[PDB]
Amino acid sequence: MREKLFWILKKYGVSDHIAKAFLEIPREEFLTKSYPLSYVYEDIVLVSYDDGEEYSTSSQPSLMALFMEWVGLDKGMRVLEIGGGTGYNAAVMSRVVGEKGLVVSVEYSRKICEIAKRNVERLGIENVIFVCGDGYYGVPEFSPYDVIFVTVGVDEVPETWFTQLKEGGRVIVPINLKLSRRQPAFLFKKKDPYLVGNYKLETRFITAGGNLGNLLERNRKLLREFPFNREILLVRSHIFVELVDLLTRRLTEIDGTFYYAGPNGVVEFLDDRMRIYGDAPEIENLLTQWESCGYRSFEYLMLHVGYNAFSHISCSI
């Protein structure tokens, strides 16, 4: 029953206003497959749709509640959810933001998105708008948003989301760190022209398709030919490459060699060494900042992701 889930969330430290949201939405109405109710209200992930071709899951309730607590989701806010699925999380967040708030959710699968629209209608929810398409583009018509809530692993936070986010808005997002076979989730706050934030924990969301899952491939198109400049010894190169992936969103690879596709140069990353073609002073700056921060991995650094500005690292503690 919903009561047990509500209680379990309270035990997790989830506040009353967010926990109450989970008490008001019947999770079973979002599952296309029948499960015993005792299973429906367990704090676990549930397959919500599976036809052999397409698949979707309802996320672990406590993780979603934590995400909501972390971004400070509350009454009257406007949220852009990426990876709506059959709609359960969107429905829960709709109760959190209340009647004056709004939830816009994007689902890439046409079939799954249509099922979500139906579920929203069946439950009589009037403040949840589902959009069927690639979350990469966001939904500018209903921006600005207070929060960008991502429930699918994405290669990057596209500039679209940044532009659609209010100054001071938050982004909770699981990033596909494919080069390390990991999915770290981060919490960012917008302070134009940056998203400033920190790593939170490892997550297990479905990996995104479309333009939210082909960044390496897309960035190959950004590569240009530049004359060789110089080489620089690089310690813990893999750790730095992870940081370039997260901070620049311009990392790509050709034949297994990773390259930063810069606007004025290309940086080829090798085993504890990097070759610079053209100019990439922004990469030299990240390296200096990283060195000043003890060469620690991304989990222990404050990230300043620039939009129409280069990125930087800080570790003031």
E-strand stretches of 83-152: 102-107, 128-132, 145-150
Q: Does 84 bind ligand SAH (CB under 6 A)?
A: yes
Q: Tokens 């003890």 sit at which residue?
A: 294
CB of 197 to Cl ion, least distance (A): 14
The listed partner (ligand SAH, Cl ion, its own copies, none) that binds 208, CB under 5 to 8 Å by sort, is ligand SAH
Q: Does 310 bind its own copies (CB under 8 A)?
A: yes
CA distances from 222 to 194, 250, 305 (A): 22, 8, 19
The residue range among 74-82, 130-138, 294-302, 304-312 that interacts with its own copies, by the rule CB under 8 A, is 304-312
Beta bridge partners of residue 188, listed in sequence order: 171, 197
For its own copies, which residue of 263, 272, 273, 295 counts as binding (CB under 8 A)? 263
Q: Does 59 bind ligand SAH (CB under 6 A)?
A: yes
Contacts 24+ apart (CB under 8 A), 94-101: 94/125, 94/127, 94/128, 95/20, 95/21, 95/24, 95/25, 96/17, 96/18, 96/21, 96/68, 97/73, 97/127, 98/127, 99/126, 99/127, 100/75, 100/76, 101/75, 101/76, 101/77, 101/127
The listed partner (its own copies, ligand SAH, Cl ion, none) that binds 214, CB under 5 to 8 Å by sort, is none
- Backbone angles phi and psi of 68, in degrees to 5: -65, -40
Annotated catalytic residue within 48, 56, 58, 59: 59
Distance between CA atoms of residues 293 and 42, nearest Å: 42
Q: Is 59 a catalytic residue?
A: yes
Neighbours of 204 (CB within 10 A): 14
For ligand SAH, which residue of 25, 41, 48, 187 counts as binding (CB under 6 A)? 48
Q: Does 62 bind ligand SAH (CB under 6 A)?
A: no
Q: Does 268 bind its own copies (CB under 8 A)?
A: no
The listed partner (its own copies, Cl ion, ligand SAH, none) that binds 82, CB under 5 to 8 Å by sort, is ligand SAH
For its own copies, which residue of 80, 153, 265, 305 counts as binding (CB under 8 A)? 265
CB of 221 to Cl ion, least distance (A): 12
Binding mask 117-156 for ligand SAH (x = CB under 6 A): -----------------xxx--------------xx----
Catalytic residues: 59
